[PDB]
Design a protein around this ligand. Structure first.
Ligand SMILES: O=C(O)CNC(=O)C(=O)O
Ligand SMILES: [Mg+2]
Ligand code: NI
Ligand SMILES: [Zn+2]
Length: 331
């Protein structure tokens, strides 16, 4: 068995290996990369996502979200308070202001210590989930707006044609902006490219151990667990590495820098935070190996998780017994 300790693997494809996206994902899996839940892909030196980032300031963040925490430093939830629209240039100036800027630090480990100690005492503002792309149309390799669609994969594997579309999303972050513990919708893969700016630190639980994280979360968030049998789908709960180690939960951590891709694998729980002003692009995707995970994915039916149009068909075809209850949650 390849990668039996479930370590995060880092890949350096050549320009020739960067041509065929599906083939390279399958290669990484042949080496055991999926067992970690997360892999890093460093593009060949010949590649670029676009020529410059000098002309992005006029992108609008229609609904910036202020991430307000409740709880204790290592075990907390966050809710998202909606703020007035602002441009990417306006948000960048805000991120760099004395109230929001990254503090002085020695290295990534010192910054990580500061994040866990102090996050709850601040409310950073995140531009999330903005439909769009920063890849140049002429970039042919690993262009997250030109991937094979999940609807086409389902149709190729299972023969059923379904409605829905699959497009990328932009994230504009600042110091302390936080992504809560989650797997993807329908336990899909994700791919995330850090276009510019400061790093993003990730934490991940191997897919084979995901239920250990779920049992800890039910213990730590007991009201939320009574409310919903899949409350991590709400994407609001944070648990620190120190608390995970205290409770014997297997995990790994890695820091992504600008110019690097991360891939999350089916049922790989992940969480993390941004170091300072940055911009990332991400999209979900599928492969043949995903289908069995899609069929077994948990679902939130309490009403909180509310998701995209295209998840309807995935539930309807892969999980027909659950469909009626899930759809009641959506309506
Ligand atoms: O970058 C973020 O805020 C969160 N991204 C992801 O969870 C991802 O790419 O799967
Ligand atoms: Mg612009
Ligand atoms: Ni994710
Ligand atoms: Zn729910």
């Amino acid at each position: 068995a390849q990668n039996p300790n479930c370590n995060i693997m880092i890949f350096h494809p050549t320009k020739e290996e960067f041509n065929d996206f599906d083939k390279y994902i399958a290669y990484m899996e042949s080496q055991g990369a999926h067992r970690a839940g997360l892999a890093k892909i460093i593009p060949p030196k010949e590649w670029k996502a676009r020529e410059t980032y000098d002309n992005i300031s006029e992108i609008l963040i229609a609904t910036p979200l202020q991430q307000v925490a409740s709880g204790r430093a290592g075990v907390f939830t966050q809710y998202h308070k909606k703020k007035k629209a602002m441009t990417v240039g306006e948000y960048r100036h805000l991120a760099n202001s004395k109230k929001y800027q990254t503090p002085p630090h020695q290295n990534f480990e010192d910054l990580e210590r500061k994040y866990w100690k102090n996050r709850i005492y601040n409310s950073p503002i995140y531009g999330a989930d903005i439909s769009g792309s920063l890849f140049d149309e002429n970039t042919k390799q690993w262009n997250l707006g030109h991937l094979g669609t999940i609807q086409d994969l389902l149709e190729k594997e299972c023969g059923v044609v379904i409605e829905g579309v699959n497009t990328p999303y932009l994230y504009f972050g600042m110091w302390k902006t936080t992504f809560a513990w989650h797997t993807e919708d329908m336990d899909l893969y994700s791919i995330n490219y850090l276009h510019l700016g400061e790093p993003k630190t990730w934490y991940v639980v191997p897919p084979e151990h995901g239920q250990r994280l779920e049992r800890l979360a039910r213990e730590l968030f007991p009201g939320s667990s009574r409310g919903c049998g899949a409350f991590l789908r709400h994407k609001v709960a944070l648990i620190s590495p120190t608390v995970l180690k205290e409770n014997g939960i297997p995990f790994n951590r890695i820091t992504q820098e600008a110019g690097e891709f991360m891939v999350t694998f089916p049922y790989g729980y992940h969480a993390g935070f941004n170091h300072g002003f940055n911009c990332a692009e991400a999209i979900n995707f599928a492969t043949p190996r995903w289908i069995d995970y899609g069929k077994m994915a948990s679902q939130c039916s309490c009403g909180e998780a509310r998701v995209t149009f295209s998840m309807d068909a995935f539930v309807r075809i892969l999980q027909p017994e659950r469909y009626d209850l899930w759809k009641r949650g959506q309506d």
